[PDB]
mmCIF file of all heavy atoms in Angstrom:
data_model
loop_
_atom_site.group_PDB
_atom_site.id
_atom_site.type_symbol
_atom_site.label_atom_id
_atom_site.label_comp_id
_atom_site.label_asym_id
_atom_site.label_seq_id
_atom_site.Cartn_x
_atom_site.Cartn_y
_atom_site.Cartn_z
ATOM 1 N N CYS A 1 2.949 7.504 4.582
ATOM 2 C CA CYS A 1 2.557 6.087 4.331
ATOM 3 C C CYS A 1 1.124 6.042 3.749
ATOM 4 O O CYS A 1 0.258 6.752 4.211
ATOM 5 C CB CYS A 1 2.583 5.337 5.658
ATOM 6 S SG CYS A 1 1.602 6.043 7.018
ATOM 7 N N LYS A 2 0.967 5.169 2.751
ATOM 8 C CA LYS A 2 -0.318 4.971 2.100
ATOM 9 C C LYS A 2 -1.367 4.481 3.084
ATOM 10 O O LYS A 2 -1.176 3.505 3.793
ATOM 11 C CB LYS A 2 -0.176 3.999 0.954
ATOM 12 C CG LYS A 2 0.864 4.417 -0.111
ATOM 13 C CD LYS A 2 0.629 5.842 -0.536
ATOM 14 C CE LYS A 2 1.058 6.060 -1.967
ATOM 15 N NZ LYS A 2 0.798 7.486 -2.447
ATOM 16 N N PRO A 3 -2.546 5.122 3.143
ATOM 17 C CA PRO A 3 -3.647 4.739 4.004
ATOM 18 C C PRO A 3 -4.503 3.628 3.393
ATOM 19 O O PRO A 3 -4.272 3.270 2.227
ATOM 20 C CB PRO A 3 -4.457 6.032 4.160
ATOM 21 C CG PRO A 3 -4.005 6.950 3.090
ATOM 22 C CD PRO A 3 -2.896 6.299 2.301
ATOM 23 N N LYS A 4 -5.423 3.087 4.144
ATOM 24 C CA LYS A 4 -6.297 2.034 3.659
ATOM 25 C C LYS A 4 -7.100 2.525 2.434
ATOM 26 O O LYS A 4 -7.508 3.693 2.402
ATOM 27 C CB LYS A 4 -7.221 1.556 4.741
ATOM 28 C CG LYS A 4 -8.505 2.352 4.963
ATOM 29 C CD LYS A 4 -8.151 3.777 5.285
ATOM 30 C CE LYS A 4 -7.691 3.919 6.733
ATOM 31 N NZ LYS A 4 -8.656 3.428 7.704
ATOM 32 N N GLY A 5 -7.326 1.647 1.477
ATOM 33 C CA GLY A 5 -8.080 1.997 0.292
ATOM 34 C C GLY A 5 -7.238 2.662 -0.746
ATOM 35 O O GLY A 5 -7.644 2.771 -1.907
ATOM 36 N N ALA A 6 -6.016 3.096 -0.402
ATOM 37 C CA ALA A 6 -5.116 3.731 -1.304
ATOM 38 C C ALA A 6 -4.304 2.704 -2.095
ATOM 39 O O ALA A 6 -4.116 1.577 -1.640
ATOM 40 C CB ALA A 6 -4.190 4.675 -0.582
ATOM 41 N N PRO A 7 -3.764 3.058 -3.308
ATOM 42 C CA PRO A 7 -2.965 2.199 -4.126
ATOM 43 C C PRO A 7 -1.531 2.078 -3.571
ATOM 44 O O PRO A 7 -0.854 3.073 -3.358
ATOM 45 C CB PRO A 7 -2.987 2.870 -5.494
ATOM 46 C CG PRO A 7 -3.139 4.311 -5.170
ATOM 47 C CD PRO A 7 -3.936 4.424 -3.899
ATOM 48 N N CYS A 8 -1.084 0.850 -3.387
ATOM 49 C CA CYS A 8 0.261 0.607 -2.858
ATOM 50 C C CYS A 8 1.107 -0.213 -3.814
ATOM 51 O O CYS A 8 0.611 -1.138 -4.475
ATOM 52 C CB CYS A 8 0.158 -0.107 -1.509
ATOM 53 S SG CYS A 8 -0.900 -1.569 -1.512
ATOM 54 N N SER A 9 2.385 0.142 -3.898
ATOM 55 C CA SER A 9 3.345 -0.525 -4.713
ATOM 56 C C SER A 9 4.463 -1.069 -3.835
ATOM 57 O O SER A 9 5.195 -0.299 -3.281
ATOM 58 C CB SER A 9 3.916 0.409 -5.813
ATOM 59 O OG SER A 9 4.768 -0.275 -6.701
ATOM 60 N N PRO A 10 4.587 -2.412 -3.719
ATOM 61 C CA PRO A 10 5.636 -3.006 -2.887
ATOM 62 C C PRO A 10 6.988 -2.410 -3.131
ATOM 63 O O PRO A 10 7.922 -2.602 -2.349
ATOM 64 C CB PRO A 10 5.631 -4.497 -3.305
ATOM 65 C CG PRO A 10 4.232 -4.732 -3.762
ATOM 66 C CD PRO A 10 3.701 -3.446 -4.376
ATOM 67 N N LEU A 11 7.116 -1.684 -4.235
ATOM 68 C CA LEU A 11 8.401 -1.051 -4.594
ATOM 69 C C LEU A 11 8.437 0.471 -4.250
ATOM 70 O O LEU A 11 9.443 0.925 -3.709
ATOM 71 C CB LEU A 11 8.632 -1.247 -6.102
ATOM 72 C CG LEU A 11 8.717 -2.667 -6.522
ATOM 73 C CD1 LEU A 11 8.912 -2.759 -8.051
ATOM 74 C CD2 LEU A 11 9.893 -3.408 -5.860
ATOM 75 N N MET A 12 7.377 1.212 -4.565
ATOM 76 C CA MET A 12 7.369 2.627 -4.295
ATOM 77 C C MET A 12 6.357 3.095 -3.278
ATOM 78 O O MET A 12 6.555 4.114 -2.629
ATOM 79 C CB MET A 12 7.092 3.341 -5.605
ATOM 80 C CG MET A 12 8.328 3.555 -6.505
ATOM 81 S SD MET A 12 9.027 2.037 -7.103
ATOM 82 C CE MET A 12 10.342 2.707 -8.152
ATOM 83 N N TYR A 13 5.276 2.349 -3.090
ATOM 84 C CA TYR A 13 4.258 2.784 -2.126
ATOM 85 C C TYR A 13 3.968 1.701 -1.100
ATOM 86 O O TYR A 13 3.102 0.854 -1.245
ATOM 87 C CB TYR A 13 2.929 3.143 -2.836
ATOM 88 C CG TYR A 13 3.076 3.807 -4.201
ATOM 89 C CD1 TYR A 13 2.374 3.307 -5.298
ATOM 90 C CD2 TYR A 13 3.935 4.849 -4.348
ATOM 91 C CE1 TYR A 13 2.558 3.927 -6.540
ATOM 92 C CE2 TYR A 13 4.114 5.434 -5.595
ATOM 93 C CZ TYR A 13 3.398 4.986 -6.670
ATOM 94 O OH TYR A 13 3.568 5.580 -7.931
ATOM 95 N N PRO A 14 4.721 1.688 0.014
ATOM 96 C CA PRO A 14 4.576 0.737 1.129
ATOM 97 C C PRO A 14 3.433 1.152 2.061
ATOM 98 O O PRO A 14 3.434 2.276 2.537
ATOM 99 C CB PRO A 14 5.910 0.786 1.816
ATOM 100 C CG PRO A 14 6.338 2.174 1.687
ATOM 101 C CD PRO A 14 5.850 2.624 0.325
ATOM 102 N N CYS A 15 2.487 0.266 2.380
ATOM 103 C CA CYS A 15 1.392 0.565 3.258
ATOM 104 C C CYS A 15 1.875 0.898 4.627
ATOM 105 O O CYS A 15 2.916 0.426 5.061
ATOM 106 C CB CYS A 15 0.409 -0.567 3.294
ATOM 107 S SG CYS A 15 -0.493 -0.897 1.746
ATOM 108 N N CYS A 16 1.167 1.771 5.342
ATOM 109 C CA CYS A 16 1.531 2.141 6.695
ATOM 110 C C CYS A 16 1.550 0.966 7.571
ATOM 111 O O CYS A 16 2.523 0.774 8.365
ATOM 112 C CB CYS A 16 0.555 3.205 7.216
ATOM 113 S SG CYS A 16 1.299 4.493 8.273
ATOM 114 N N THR A 17 0.500 0.169 7.580
ATOM 115 C CA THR A 17 0.395 -1.030 8.401
ATOM 116 C C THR A 17 0.333 -2.309 7.538
ATOM 117 O O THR A 17 -0.517 -2.424 6.679
ATOM 118 C CB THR A 17 -0.807 -0.992 9.329
ATOM 119 O OG1 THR A 17 -1.998 -0.704 8.579
ATOM 120 C CG2 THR A 17 -0.624 0.104 10.415
ATOM 121 N N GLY A 18 1.235 -3.234 7.783
ATOM 122 C CA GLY A 18 1.246 -4.471 7.013
ATOM 123 C C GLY A 18 1.728 -4.262 5.596
ATOM 124 O O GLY A 18 1.922 -3.154 5.127
ATOM 125 N N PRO A 19 1.928 -5.331 4.811
ATOM 126 C CA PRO A 19 2.407 -5.257 3.456
ATOM 127 C C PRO A 19 1.262 -4.896 2.469
ATOM 128 O O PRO A 19 0.099 -5.016 2.809
ATOM 129 C CB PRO A 19 2.880 -6.693 3.148
ATOM 130 C CG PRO A 19 2.068 -7.544 4.020
ATOM 131 C CD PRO A 19 1.740 -6.761 5.254
ATOM 132 N N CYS A 20 1.664 -4.448 1.273
ATOM 133 C CA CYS A 20 0.688 -4.057 0.227
ATOM 134 C C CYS A 20 -0.264 -5.232 -0.096
ATOM 135 O O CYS A 20 0.256 -6.348 -0.388
ATOM 136 C CB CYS A 20 1.390 -3.565 -0.982
ATOM 137 S SG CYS A 20 0.264 -3.050 -2.336
ATOM 138 N N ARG A 21 -1.561 -5.022 0.014
ATOM 139 C CA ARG A 21 -2.505 -6.081 -0.299
ATOM 140 C C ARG A 21 -2.755 -6.228 -1.792
ATOM 141 O O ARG A 21 -3.904 -6.219 -2.248
ATOM 142 C CB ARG A 21 -3.810 -5.793 0.433
ATOM 143 C CG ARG A 21 -4.710 -6.986 0.585
ATOM 144 C CD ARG A 21 -5.868 -6.709 1.507
ATOM 145 N NE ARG A 21 -6.746 -7.846 1.625
ATOM 146 C CZ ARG A 21 -7.798 -7.898 2.447
ATOM 147 N NH1 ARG A 21 -8.094 -6.888 3.205
ATOM 148 N NH2 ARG A 21 -8.534 -8.973 2.512
ATOM 149 N N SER A 22 -1.678 -6.341 -2.566
ATOM 150 C CA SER A 22 -1.769 -6.520 -3.991
ATOM 151 C C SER A 22 -2.516 -5.379 -4.707
ATOM 152 O O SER A 22 -3.594 -5.607 -5.272
ATOM 153 C CB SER A 22 -2.437 -7.859 -4.321
ATOM 154 O OG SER A 22 -2.521 -8.070 -5.699
ATOM 155 N N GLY A 23 -1.961 -4.174 -4.678
ATOM 156 C CA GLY A 23 -2.572 -3.055 -5.360
ATOM 157 C C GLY A 23 -3.147 -2.016 -4.402
ATOM 158 O O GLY A 23 -3.053 -0.833 -4.695
ATOM 159 N N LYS A 24 -3.668 -2.426 -3.297
ATOM 160 C CA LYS A 24 -4.277 -1.501 -2.324
ATOM 161 C C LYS A 24 -3.897 -1.887 -0.880
ATOM 162 O O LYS A 24 -3.420 -3.029 -0.647
ATOM 163 C CB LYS A 24 -5.775 -1.438 -2.473
ATOM 164 C CG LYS A 24 -6.471 -2.791 -2.353
ATOM 165 C CD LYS A 24 -6.886 -3.087 -0.887
ATOM 166 C CE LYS A 24 -7.638 -4.382 -0.747
ATOM 167 N NZ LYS A 24 -8.194 -4.580 0.604
ATOM 168 N N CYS A 25 -4.109 -0.958 0.025
ATOM 169 C CA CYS A 25 -3.800 -1.177 1.437
ATOM 170 C C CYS A 25 -5.002 -1.728 2.189
ATOM 171 O O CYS A 25 -5.090 -2.989 2.325
ATOM 172 C CB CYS A 25 -3.347 0.128 2.090
ATOM 173 S SG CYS A 25 -1.672 0.739 1.555
#
């Protein structure tokens, strides 16, 4: 799971905690 500060994609990179904050966790 993508950690805080990392780039998240609601499609391919789901944040560990909570939803993707529009580009980052």
Side-chain angles (χ1 to χ4, degrees):
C1 55
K2 302 311 208 177
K4 84 299 288 302
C8 50
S9 185
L11 301 175
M12 275 67 175
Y13 325 130
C15 293
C16 216
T17 53
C20 180
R21 199 170 180 176
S22 181
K24 56 90 177 186
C25 290

